[PDB]
Amino acid sequence: TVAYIAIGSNLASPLEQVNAALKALGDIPESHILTVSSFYRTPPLGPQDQPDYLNAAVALETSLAPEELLNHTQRIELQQGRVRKAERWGPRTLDLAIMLFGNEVINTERLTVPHYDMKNRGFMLWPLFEIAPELVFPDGEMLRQILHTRAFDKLNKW
Ligand SMILES: Nc1ncnc2c1ncn2[C@@H]1O[C@H](COP(=O)(O)CP(=O)(O)OP(=O)(O)O)[C@@H](O)[C@H]1O
Numbered sequence: 432t433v434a435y436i437a438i439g440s441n442l443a444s445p446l447e448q449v450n451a452a453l454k455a456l457g458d459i460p461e462s463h464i465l466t467v468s469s470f471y472r473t474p475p476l477g478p479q480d481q482p483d484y485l486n487a488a489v490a491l492e493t494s495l496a497p498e499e500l501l502n503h504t505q506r507i508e509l510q511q512g513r514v515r516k517a518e519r520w521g522p523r524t525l526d527l528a529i530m531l532f533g534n535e536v537i538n539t540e541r542l543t544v545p546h547y548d549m550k551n552r553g554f555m556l557w558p559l560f561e562i563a564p565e566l567v568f569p570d571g572e573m574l575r576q577i578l579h580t581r582a583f584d585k586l587n588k589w
């Protein structure tokens with residue numbers, strides 16, 4: 432199954448964080464990277480007392496169960512010093528979001544796929560569109576037509 436993973440970092444040298452994340456993603460068992468996007472510098476969504484993000488997307492072929500993939504992405508976050516605090520939408524060294532897991536629809540306590548807010552976020556959709564221009568969501572919507580509808584600001588390279 433092809434999983435699409437969003438990468439974000441705005442602490443502790445985001446370029447190094449994203450490169451480390453890509454290396455680690457490729458080392459996940461029973462999985463391999465298919466495609467990687469460019470790196471983008473994006474202004475923060477949410478609180479404004481935090482640095483700009485590096486955002487990117489990856490396509491990962493995997494035979495892991497989705498929750499097992501999640502276990503691995505969370506391990507990578509922790510390896511790269513991810514902490515969590517009370518604030519929502521706050522800064523982080525590394526975040527990995529499972530945007531899609533094939534065409535699956537998953538609604539569980541630990542895991543919601545497609546990612547619950549991605550259709551509202553240019554910083555998730557644009558890097559995804561770079562690597563999967565033909566992508567269709569489980570609900571039948573085309574990524575290309577969502578981007579044209581919402582007309583989110585285009586991104587700048589990191
Ligand atoms: N599709 C998905 N990808 C990654 N984590 C997911 C997920 N669906 C649910 N989660 C849950 O997300 C929790 C961690 O949330 P956080 O990483 O703190 C929010 P965030 O990723 O910073 O912002 P966002 O969810 O608003 O994009 C995990 O414990 C995990 O169970």
Ligand SMILES: Nc1nc2c(c(=O)[nH]1)N=C(CO)CN2
Pocket residue numbers: 438439440473474475476477484486519520521554
């Ligand atoms: N530009 C940008 N802003 C964000 C990001 C992200 O990846 N990029 N993720 C967040 C999740 O809470 C908080 N805000």
Ligand SMILES: [Cl-]
Pocket residue numbers: 545568569570571
């Ligand atoms: Cl959908």
Ligand SMILES: [Mg+2]
Pocket residue numbers: 526527528
């Ligand atoms: Mg997260």
